[PDB]
Design a protein around this ligand. Structure first.
Ligand code: A1BGM
Lengths: 39, 156
């Protein structure tokens, strides 16, 4: 049985940790909501 | 129940101790999460109850108390912030420039950041603090790393 707890405000924060790449990927989406890589 | 706008953890006691199964966004009195986090079950906020109002397993989205409220969109250019809420850790902003899921039905923004499965539902923000979608449905790439769609619902 499931409950929620507040974790914070939804704000853009000046000088947050900037990271991650930007891949362009070929994906399929099935009826069950699963993404997969095409090639 | 707590109806305050903001980001929330989704918790279960059904496993060992208290386990974070994911994250959602409270906005305009409606709780927004991913379907795979709750499987459409009811939720507790204190001694208030939240009942599911809308959902769709293919979009992997679910709204509680009211219809989906979040209509902001990635502009396909600017950087965004994942407001990540990892299990047992503080809310942290992680800024990134999204990649792309190319699909037969169209292109979606994608964010390439690794977090435990319990971070599913964490909101993705534009520069004005608006939620442009939720993190936690996507794919594992040729590296073993995770890439999530920017998953956004429709407003009516
Ligand atoms: C297919 N949909 C419809 C249902 C499901 N989707 C999931 C995806 N869970 C998830 C979420 C997030 Cl934010 C990270 C990870 C993850 O594995 N990340 C590392 C770093 C690779 C390992 O910790 C896994 C579960 S069922």
């Amino acid at each position: 049985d499931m409950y929620i707890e507040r974790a914070g405000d939804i704000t853009w924060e000046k000088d947050a940790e900037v990271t991650g790449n930007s891949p362009r990927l070929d994906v399929a989406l099935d009826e069950s909501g699963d993404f997969s890589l095409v090639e | 129940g707590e109806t305050t706008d903001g980001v929330y953890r989704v918790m279960t006691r059904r496993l060992l101790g208290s386990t974070q199964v994911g994250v959602g966004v409270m906005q305009e009195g409606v709780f927004h999460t991913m379907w795979h986090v709750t499987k459409g079950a009811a939720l507790r906020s204190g001694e208030g109850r939240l009942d599911p109002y809308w959902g769709d397993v293919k979009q992997d989205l679910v709204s509680y108390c009211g219809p989906w409220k979040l209509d902001a969109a990635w502009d396909g250019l600017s950087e965004v912030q994942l407001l990540a809420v990892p299990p047992g850790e503080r809310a942290k902003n992680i800024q990134t420039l999204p990649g792309i899921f190319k699909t037969k039905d169209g292109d979606i923004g994608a964010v390439a950041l690794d977090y435990p499965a319990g971070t599913s539902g964490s909101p993705i923000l534009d520069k004005c603090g608006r939620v442009i979608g939720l993190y936690g449905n996507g794919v594992v790439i040729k590296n073993g790393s995770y890439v999530s769609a920017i998953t956004q619902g429709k407003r009516e």
